Amino acid sequence: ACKIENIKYKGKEVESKLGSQLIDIFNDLDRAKEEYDKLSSPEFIAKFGDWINDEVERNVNEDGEPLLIQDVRQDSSKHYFFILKNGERFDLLTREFDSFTSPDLTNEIKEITDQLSYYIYNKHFSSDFEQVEGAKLNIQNEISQFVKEGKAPVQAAYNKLQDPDIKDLLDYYDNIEKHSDEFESEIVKFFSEKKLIIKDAELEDVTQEGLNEGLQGGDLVQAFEKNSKDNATANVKLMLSFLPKIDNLTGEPALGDYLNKPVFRSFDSIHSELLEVLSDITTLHVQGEVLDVFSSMYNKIKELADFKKSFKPLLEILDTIDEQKKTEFVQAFYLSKINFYTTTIETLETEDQNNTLTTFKVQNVSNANNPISSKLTEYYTNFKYKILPGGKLNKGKLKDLQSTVTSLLEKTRKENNPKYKSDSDFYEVFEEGVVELMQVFEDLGVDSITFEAMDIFLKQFRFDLPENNAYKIMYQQYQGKLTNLNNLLKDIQSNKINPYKINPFKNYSNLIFNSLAEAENYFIENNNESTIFSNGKTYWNFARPSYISNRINTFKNNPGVLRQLLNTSYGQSSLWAKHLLGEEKNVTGDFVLAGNARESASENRLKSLELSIFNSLQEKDKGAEGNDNGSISIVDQLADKLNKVLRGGTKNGTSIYSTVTPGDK
Amino acid sequence: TVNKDGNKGFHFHGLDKSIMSEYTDDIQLTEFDISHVVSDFTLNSILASIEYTKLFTGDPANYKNMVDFFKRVPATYTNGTNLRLGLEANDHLFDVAVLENIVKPSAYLKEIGESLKLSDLSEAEKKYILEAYEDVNQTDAQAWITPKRWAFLISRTGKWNSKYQSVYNKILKSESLDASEMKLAAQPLKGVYFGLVNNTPTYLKYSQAVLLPQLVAGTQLQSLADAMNKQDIGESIVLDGVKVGATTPNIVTDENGDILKSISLNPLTLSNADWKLQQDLPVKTIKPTLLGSQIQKNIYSSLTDEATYTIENEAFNGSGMFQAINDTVSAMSNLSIAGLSSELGKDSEGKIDKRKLYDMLEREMLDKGSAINLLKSIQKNLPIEAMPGIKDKLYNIVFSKINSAAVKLKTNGGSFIQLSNFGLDKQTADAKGITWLVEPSDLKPPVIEKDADGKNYIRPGQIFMSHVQIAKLVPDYAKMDSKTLSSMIDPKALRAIGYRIPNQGQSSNDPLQIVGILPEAMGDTIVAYTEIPTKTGSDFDIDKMYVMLPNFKVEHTKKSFKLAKDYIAQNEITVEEMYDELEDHGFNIDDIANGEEVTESAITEAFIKNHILNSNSELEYHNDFVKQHNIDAVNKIDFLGYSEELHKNKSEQLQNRLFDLYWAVLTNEKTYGDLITPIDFPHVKDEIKRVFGDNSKQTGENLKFHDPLYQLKLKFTYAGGKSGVGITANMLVDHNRSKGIDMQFNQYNLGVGHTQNGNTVFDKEYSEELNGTRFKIKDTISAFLNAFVDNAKDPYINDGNFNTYTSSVAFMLIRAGVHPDWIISFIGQPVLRELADFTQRYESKIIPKEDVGKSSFDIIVEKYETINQESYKDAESRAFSLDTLQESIEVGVHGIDLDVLKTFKGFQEQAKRLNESVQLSRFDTNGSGKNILDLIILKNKIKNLYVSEQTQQKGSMMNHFKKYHNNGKITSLGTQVKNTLLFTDDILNNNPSLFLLGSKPIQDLVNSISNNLVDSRGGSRGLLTNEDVGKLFYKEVYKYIMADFAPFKVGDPMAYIKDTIFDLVNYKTEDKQYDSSNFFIENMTVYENSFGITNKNKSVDFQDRLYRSAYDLMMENPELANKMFISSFLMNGFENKLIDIKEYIPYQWFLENDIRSFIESKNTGLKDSSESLRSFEEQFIKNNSDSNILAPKVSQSVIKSIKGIKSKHVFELPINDKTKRYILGATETKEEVLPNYVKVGSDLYRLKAYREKSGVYVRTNKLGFEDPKSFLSIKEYKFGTRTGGNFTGELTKQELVYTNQWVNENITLANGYISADSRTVDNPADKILEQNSLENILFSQNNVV
Ligand SMILES: [Cl-]
Ligand SMILES: [Cl-]
Ligand SMILES: [Cl-]
Ligand SMILES: [Cl-]
Ligand SMILES: [Cl-]
Ligand SMILES: [Cl-]
Ligand SMILES: [Cl-]
Ligand SMILES: [Cl-]
Ligand SMILES: [Cl-]
Ligand SMILES: [Cl-]
Ligand code: NA
Ligand code: NA
Ligand code: NA
Ligand code: NA
């Protein structure tokens, strides 16, 4: 008991009915009296009225207290508020999931919701989904049944010997059942988002509007205006949703520290990775063998499952899955990368002559803010903070880093011995040095650095490959990168590379920081979608394949057709087939490259070949005034085409040839 | 160009220094270096084009010709769902048969001629129509696939399911689909194909109708289908459906046109890897379908008062129908918006229920799917302005509901894919398949016939269609004999009205009669008479046809009523609950006089009918009922009836009334001509091609077809039409709408075109007569529309200089009445073509402007002033003759250049007036706009056109408001704008406590700031009519209003956020030592001067987890979260920037900091006095001073220095020919007034005084901070008082205070400088706008003698 009493009738046996209401709705005996004493504050009396001395008529309960008004919404949400003199809403700021009190509350309720969703999925949707739609099942019964099932053995362990920890676990499961309708709402949202919703009214409205404006057919909405996740059926969506996070230490699926039930990896990150690796895979007639796209895809997964073990069960699922669901997975990721070329023009004036000169730079916006390159820029700005305060190079601390890395190189030269062969030996001799590298990288601006990544950074991205003999590889990388740092420092101290103009991390990207950014991105989930933003519209960087993309992917992954193209009457004069295939001929008929050079050349020439779509042309720092393929003037497009064609004349440059004009597309 | 030493050379724009260095490092280019660069470009691009033909397109010899080659190139671009192969046998191949084109003469040719004899049409015109119907392409781009092929295609695209397996098994066994499988029908696949079959390019553009056994049963086509099953031929495409690479087509027809009894096809094996399902069009059965925006106004084209249109018990003339139709559609609108009114509790004054508004918004956000943060913000009934993340979306939702209710009117119907009637209307043996409702016969076109009374009507065309409505209402309809179904459904219920968007004419609309119901498994499939392609100008791969269908009145079985009564008494649904669920209340308003409170049986019967025996109902009573009880087949289906009194009619009744009115229009004698004329209108095409040449015949001299320049020009030529199709459709539909009213220029005559009382009058029937020919305006606009829509098939319209520079003037000339030949000769004049090309070339980024501000027109007039040695001042605007224009094109005529330029500029300015009228004639589509700003601009445009008409301004537009209200009778568009623009304006005005940004003070503020702006060429912008300035206004006014919020009031913004950034990164570092991270902080990317999230797209779960993590931070480290939120406002001002995090700031933070009281006090403070907003204006201009319209950039050349002080600090702008661009207008005393704010170079100036005809400008401070390296656009605002920027440099502050010293020392009247505060523009419009309300302005109808 010890309930709260009416302040207006202070010093009497009466209790606060409003106080009991507040007690019932906040579930905290202290917080209810706290809010009640907040009500008696003078500001509330002035804004609402004096119920302690005078007797108000409008906004009062039976016993003379400001009544709580409960609004139940269309989604059965309960909100509590007061009405003041003005008629204004005094919101009571009630919270959902009050019983759970973790300071990191978000991932706690996420773990519980994900486990309930996995329970219901494995029970009902494990076979098929498109017939039940989460309506045959009753969520509430499933919540209660999961609670009972997870509670039974804990109740037995409690009956064996009384322990407050076991009672705490029992109360935690009871609390999971207590908020069963809120978890129901969360998982209804989870399951409804998977199945795509068809919308006929506004679809027909926009179709009629586009036909009025003159958009015949598929040209109504562009392919890259539709997101790639709409291609993944709800079965594939769930199948990718319930994959476990592997523990970075034990190398096995990790457990949620709240319920000791395995926690699952985000769907968005998995979908992004699989798009990156499963895209641009198409059917091929390679050597009289028609390629089942599902196989190559599968192989990719398997290969990827050797690096990131989180995908081990997905592969497993693809083995124990129906052939129809195999096709559903295929069409979920049977897409093509669609990268956008934006031409930025910048005009400057000469130093002395005071005449104009321009520069055209064609950037790939689709894979522009990729996870690796962004990290480099993330380094650079963080490097500006720690080493360049206000534009002054802290050469003292940088020389300190030089001394540290040189002493580390001395230690490597001193303690190197071939008898060391395992990773344990390498760590036994160099853990302190690895930690000092962590510190020098952190001081250089790699704030996000973590020891685990360093492991991979020293393992040269070989995980199950090294096996017993691994000291060499690691050591190599160690000294290599260490030496490179010294060189970088000697280039940044002696001002061969000035930090104020050119980004050092970009310069030493190949030698040091590409691998480092890759290694520390291995542990972070990227929930973003591969999209771009162009002239107010949002475009997606993966689109359902086209004939031209299929043809280029065939040239890249089955070059033999090119040979057959050279064997036909018309395709015999192809310069591009010969160039891509390496059989470049001279003025008399002899090959310009030797056999060893021809094989390597064709590989690189095929890899560099890149289909793209012209996104926009824009003046530097004025992207809002940009022109796409529809609004660009003939003069601007002619200049862009000129520079794109002639850019192959400069060394370390490549030309970009547009196709034959595709009618009115 | 010439360098410093006087040597000549070349400078080449748009070539970057990196490539130019590869030729010569010198600053100047010689002729040889230009030859080098151009030769490199040309030859390499030619070789690349050839390579593309070698690797991707294929040998161009396989194409019809070189001209069609570029039209077929898009095949290489085709995208679609490619299909999975390689898993059984020969996956990668499928056999196709290429068939002959089916080109017949119309079987009913005699009847079409005998009907045209009654059409009151020209003789050569009738001959043209008849000979056009002598050559009908029946199967243009048509294909048929076997059900096996359909199943393969769907299974390999992942779309297969067990219910597809059921419907496929039923398709093979000719079993009728149940109600659940209707959405799983085998409608024709919208696929496309392009591949290289043995190094021959094969391109297949076609629709893949599935040869269901139920379709081919009992018809000729069966034979065809049979062979395909026997020969494992999956697909069958007509020759016109295989653009390139077709083998010799195999013949399948007899001498008499019948198809062969036994067929053996020559197969062509293709590759499945090259096939792709291009459009996955869904299956949408008979449903509420949005009535086409174009047809409901193009129907007036054939209305004539010389006819009598007769519906049941009503008869109208041409004029009456106009009103009648309008009246009916108006009624619909009034009904719909009334419903919305009840949804909002709209008072008589206009105040609405806050609870109901937020309920509607919550339901829409729930249905659409919303982040829990934003939906909780809505649920808390917070004021719309207190929710920064979603304020714009909520305004959008309100506007969308209003427009959709009042404008997006619906009838019964659907969208249907066309299928050729090749072997389907000609029957053999007995047809168990197609459910025939009449005696089986050929599908016949619309012809004129006599009824019993002898009056000539139009026999409607005959149609096949999957009437899913009948199938669900009458199951087992395919079982029934013809006679029982014929009597069962009302003959007036088997009719339909089929239109095609775009409606290029009355031919696109057809009145049709359903002679047979196709199998349900053909989905949205429509089979029409054999001549519909020639009439409608339609292929069979064009988009879905639209049709409007009648609504049904159904007689349900007595057993259905008995079972429903047993269920409703068993389940204990109370008598009131029924009444409660039937919010329609059809009897409560007027039929309770006898009903009162006593009648329960009526409400029970109506509830049964409307929510238990109604197949489509959301109440779920029908579904739970059909769970165990099974409904019975309806006894009779009838045409639902209407009343003459529109208030008696509900929505369905009004829909059917509109249907019958359109039927009477489309089935009348006098309209047959307009119905049967094929859609090609050739006068403009033929004149363009005779005067400028036929470009359909081209040769590749000098390797032209691979030249980059030729391909670029061809791309632009093809892309021209996508712009013109929309404007031409609008122009046609407006002319058809406004034919009766005589819109005219007040005191302006173009010199050509029809005139009334010395004024150019618009939208007469015919054009002027010129050389014995005169053409209807309808026909000319239809010809232009057809040119634009078929631009890809033949790009002739651009050859006549008809482009976006000349479109407005061309259509003004058309509607004025000018002969098409004269328009073609005038717009196609060579000097105007030079003007157009130079307009495009001039605004380009590559070519720098010699004199910015000199318009392209000015450059051209100066060129031809120098060439002709004449002055444009002494040139006049002359209405020329054809011989002058036509000759000048063929052989130059001297002395007419400057005159045609003057005529074109005058015509262009008056075309501005006409297009201003057209833009206010689009309330039946756009409504009041999608945004609040669009409503502002629409209202201001209405007011401006009104005050221009009333002031009797010279080139004004008259009789425009007769489009809303004419002949004392409200019109369709008038009602539309009444309950869209005026409705939303009433809501916004009469609910100031809710919509602050929509309140009258904010609108008046934007009107004032717009009036204080100067449009180029010397105008005062007046009321807010420019879109960009309005967008800037609202985006900055939200910041200005929010700047008074107590947490946001922090001095030195830049420093503050920096501190925040510091704190931020610290958190990150420390979090590493805890190994349990905060999701909100993890997704933050810090820049040099800002922080936020990447603007890449984000799923709802990701946003929700971000919001939850931000709320967890609000509890863990509340000061850091507070700092981050304040920085989120200071950095961006809730504007949709590239690093915005406003939608993840928990609403708990705004509520906790008392945003409710803040917004409510702001509302009640602006309710009585708008003084608090007074200090906003300058800050606005001082923050976005980069805008060339807020602060016009004045050339330093025309600037004149003043004694004592440097030019940079204070200068004087004199009124001049070169400065006429800046005078806003005249004061009361005829004094000229200059703009308040002007920037020169990179310095801002505010006008201080006037000396004589000159105004003095002094430097002032800029506000805000711009850092593109960090995506940072800080704006500095203070509410109610003036503010000083914290970012102006120290030396700049010293210079400014010294300038202030000097200007205060000697600018006084003793020196002759009148202070700027005296000069204000004298606006005449203000009086009119004060004395007239928006309603009276829109409807006019003020009494006169
Ligand atoms: Cl120059
Ligand atoms: Cl590139
Ligand atoms: Cl760099
Ligand atoms: Cl693509
Ligand atoms: Cl584009
Ligand atoms: Cl099958
Ligand atoms: Cl807005
Ligand atoms: Cl409606
Ligand atoms: Cl091109
Ligand atoms: Cl960005
Ligand atoms: Na051949
Ligand atoms: Na051949
Ligand atoms: Na004329
Ligand atoms: Na300045």
Q: How far apart are CA B1026 and CA B363, in angstroms?
A: 34
The DSSP H or E segment spanning B419 is strand B410-419
Q: Would you state the structure tokens that stand for residue B1244, as one six-digit string?
A: 């801002």
The DSSP H or E segment spanning A184 is helix A180-194
How many contacts does A have with B, using Cβ atoms within 8 A?
A: 389
Sign of CA dihedral B334, B337, B339, B344: negative
CA angle B1057/B1058/B1059 to nearest 5° reads: 90
Nearest to B86 among A131, A291, A347 (CB): A291
| Block residue for tokens 């039929």 | B591
DSSP assignments along A264-314, one per residue: B--HHHHHHHHHHHHTT----EETTEE--HHHHHHHHHHHHHHHSGGGHHH
CA angle B371/B376/B377 to nearest 5° reads: 100
Nearest to B54 among A79, A540, A571 (CB): A571
- Residues of chain B found within 8 Å of residue A291, distances taken between Cβ atoms: 85-86
- Local structure of residue B544 (DSSP, 8 states): P
Q: How far apart are CA A629 and CA B580, in angstroms?
A: 56
Give B888's contacts (C-beta < 8 A, 6+ positions apart): B829, B830, B896
Residues B1166/B392, Cβ–Cβ less than 8 Å: no
Interface of B with A in 915-944 (CB under 8 A): 925
Q: What is the largest CA-CA distance in chain B?
A: 110
Instruction: Give chain B's radius of gyration (CA, Å).
Output: 35
Give B1120's contacts (C-beta < 8 A, 6+ positions apart): B1060, B1063, B1064, B1067, B1113
CA distance B78 to chain A (A): 5
**For residue B278, how many other CB atoms are within 10 A of its CB?**
21
DSSP assignments along A447-503, one per residue: TT--HHHHHHHHHTT-SSSSTT--HHHHHHHHHHHHHHHHHHHHHHHTTSS-TTTS-
Residues B361/B402, Cβ–Cβ less than 8 Å: no
Distance of CA A399 to the CA centre of its chain: 38
- Residues of chain B found within 8 Å of residue A359, distances taken between Cβ atoms: 16-18
Residue at B769: amino acid letter? E
b vs e for B330-365, b when ≥16 Cβ sit within 10 Å of the residue's Cβ?
A: bbbbbbbbeebeebbebeeeebbeeeebbbbbbebb
The DSSP H or E segment spanning B333 is helix B318-344
Tell me the HSE value of A521 on the side-chain side, using a 13 A CA sphere. 18
Whether the CB of B709 is below 8 Å from some CB of chain A: the reply is: yes
| Block residue for tokens 């950014």 | A517
CB contact under 8 A, A545 and B82: yes
- Local structure of residue A539 (DSSP, 8 states): E
Residues B27/A350, Cβ–Cβ less than 8 Å: yes
Q: How far apart are CA B389 and CA B374, in angstroms?
A: 8
Burial of A651 (0-12, 13-18, 19+ CB in 10 A): exposed
Q: How far apart are CA B240 and CA B869, in angstroms?
A: 57
Nearest to B85 among A267, A292, A649 (CB): A292
Q: How far apart are CA B711 and CA B708, in angstroms?
A: 5
Nearest to B194 among A267, A285, A547 (CB): A547
Interface of B with A in 403-422 (CB under 8 A): 408, 415
Query: CA of B869: how far to CAs of B467, B857, B901, B1262, in Å?
Result: 73, 17, 15, 48
Q: How far apart are CA B1082 and CA B548, in angstroms?
A: 55
Q: How far apart are CA A629 and CA A613, in angstroms?
A: 9
Closest C-alpha to B973, from B924, B1033, B1012: B924
- Residues of chain B found within 8 Å of residue A619, distances taken between Cβ atoms: 845
Task: Measure A583 CA to ligand 10 centroid, in angstroms.
Answer: 43
Angle, helices A180-194 vs B1100-1116, to 10°: value is: 140
Question: Quick one: closest CA in A to B363, which residue?
Answer: A74
The end-to-end CA distance of chain B, in Å, is: 70
SS3 assignment, position A361: strand
CB contact under 8 A, A649 and B14: no
Tell me the HSE value of B384 on the side-chain side, using a 13 A CA sphere. 24
- Residues of chain B found within 8 Å of residue A294, distances taken between Cβ atoms: 84, 87
CB contact under 8 A, B1108 and A106: yes
CB contact under 8 A, A130 and B846: no
Helices and strands counted in chain A (H then E):
25, 13
Q: Nearest ligand to the C-alpha of residue A552? A: 4
Residues B356/B344, Cβ–Cβ less than 8 Å: yes
Task: Measure A341 CA to ligand 2 centroid, in angstroms.
Answer: 7
The end-to-end CA distance of chain A, in Å, is: 77
Give B624's contacts (C-beta < 8 A, 6+ positions apart): none
CB contact under 8 A, A212 and B293: yes
Q: Nearest ligand to the C-alpha of residue A338? A: 4
Whether the CB of B716 is below 8 Å from some CB of chain A: the reply is: yes
Query: CA of B717: how far to CAs of B710, B714, B1266, in Å?
Result: 10, 5, 41
Burial of B641 (0-12, 13-18, 19+ CB in 10 A): middle
| Block residue for tokens 């919270």 | A95
| Block residue for tokens 């030496």 | A483
Do the strands A613-619 and A340-349 form a parallel or antiparallel pair, or are they unpaired?
parallel
Residue at B940: amino acid letter? N
Whether the CB of B432 is below 8 Å from some CB of chain A: the reply is: no
Give A172's contacts (C-beta < 8 A, 6+ positions apart): A259
Interface test with A, best of B244, B418, B845, B1114 (most A CBs within 10 A): B845
CB contact under 8 A, A548 and B501: no
Whether the CB of B577 is below 8 Å from some CB of chain A: the reply is: no
Q: Which long-range contacts (CB under 8 A, 24 or more apart) does B859-868 make?
A: B860/B831, B860/B834, B860/B835, B860/B901, B861/B898, B861/B901, B864/B831, B864/B897, B864/B898, B864/B901, B865/B898, B867/B897, B868/B894, B868/B895, B868/B897, B868/B898
Q: Would you state the structure tokens that stand for residue B76, as one six-digit string?
A: 């290489």
Closest C-alpha to B705, from B74, B41, B60: B60
Closest C-alpha to B144, from B476, B413, B496, B417: B417
Backbone angles phi, psi at B886, to 5 degrees: -60, -40
Q: Would you state the structure tokens that stand for residue B1012, as one six-digit string?
A: 């204080």
